[model samples]
Target: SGIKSLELLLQSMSPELMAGDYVFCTVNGALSDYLSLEPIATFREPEGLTLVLEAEKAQQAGLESSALFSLITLTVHSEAVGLTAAFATKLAEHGISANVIAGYYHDHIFVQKEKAQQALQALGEFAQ
Candidate 1:
């Protein structure tokens, strides 16, 4: 009965503000170098690998990092239509800049810690 389709995904939405603080970081060389750090998400940019990990663990890990972004997970099917744009617009309405990590069954939004709660509030009451 879960995730019928991305069309009704927003209608089926349940956004959860996850625990702890996360960060955006950049590293080079092999992926296994920071295996112990255990990041929630990673990407390969032109310069280096992008890592989304805990603030505590990332501290002094020596890779370039930026911002304290908390995690907000939207557990739903997937994106259809302009659903991707819809999220940025929704969050943008609240003046919250969101960086989303797209996953198979879920999407994680990295919102600034300063506005994490506000973003969650903005998210929970949005759409229907």
Candidate 2:
């Protein structure tokens, strides 16, 4: 079972940002139209198909995006709880915004490109 204790979850997150920039875009076309683009993540929301792809790839595909984020993936398994609030709260304490994504085996955090390293450091210090 996932850990429900907020304290333990905070101590064990072990978050790290991967070495690349990512961009988010919304596409209202069929999946086949962009299948070859190979998005890192996609969500079918009521508004449209949200795609998370590499910055260069997204630009090459002519997709308009607003934010460039650095992705931080937690090593912990997905079933764990309290991570979102723990880290989000920590980041917020430092005035850093976070956009979190829940994956099958881990959680991904997206923060502004300019603040990526600071965000990573904040999380590392929080886990300590």
Candidate 3:
């Protein structure tokens, strides 16, 4: 059901630019404080919970993010390989940063807000 072939993934890599600016934030303690925010992703570590949140919610909560990004999701299933390298390399060629999140069904790339559209176009060109 998921794509595994590197070459096939390239040809079928479907990239979709999602709405809004996403910011990365870290919460010091319990998840309760940010539960209402509905963070898109959360990773708990010794320091804090690294969270991916929409800009407006983060702003409302007064969360400070060092960087801002626009999210592009590859709507392709991924029991695969080399997909990350291809798009990430493609993005890097244009001086774009590809911060990736590998979900069960898709891979999401968070590129710097300033260069998001350029990154999206770059990925598009990468596909057949």
Candidate 4:
């Protein structure tokens, strides 16, 4: 199935966004081998690919990487194509390294910390 209808928005990536570095969305326990992924974050509401760092984990590592990345979501139907190489090409052109995660309803992108804002602006331009 392919995602239906598409939209994009220019949004600010907040510092208060979840600060965990190891948070990953997985079937975790799904029983099917369906390689389905989407631009939606169902694990948590208003969810999108975020820079997650456990406050305690960072303290233990004696390091902290402030999560200053934008959570850009590409909405698709319950069944949409997985991350596209084209998407990667666009981000790479702007020197933005993106980590893509597929949820059940949408595909999420976590742009590099240094390039998040520019990434958002770039994506917003794309949406337009």
| Candidate 1 residue-wise lDDT, 27-71, digit = tens | 886788878999888898999888889998889676557888989
Which candidate ranks first by lDDT, i.e. highest? 3
Superposed by TM-score, candidate 2 places the C-alpha of residue 107 at a distance from the truth, in angstroms, of 0.5
Best by TM-score: 3
Off by over 4 Å in 1: 1-8, 77-79
lDDT tens readout by residue for model 4, 31-110: 22212332123343243323243334434544434544445565422222323554666678898877776656555676
lDDT of each: 0.80, 0.82, 0.84, 0.45
Higher-lDDT candidate of 2 and 3: 3
Instruction: Report RMSD for candidate 2.
Output: 2.9
Name the 10 consecutive residues with the lowest summed lDDT in model 4.
8-17
**In candidate 4, which residue ranges exceed 4 Å CA deviation?**
1-57, 60-70, 76-83
lDDT of 3 by residue, 53-78 (tens): 99889989888875789999986532
Q: How big is the RMSD of model 3? A: 3.2
TM-scores of the candidates in the order shown: 0.84, 0.87, 0.88, 0.45
What is the alpha-carbon lDDT of model 3 when measured against the actual structure?
0.84
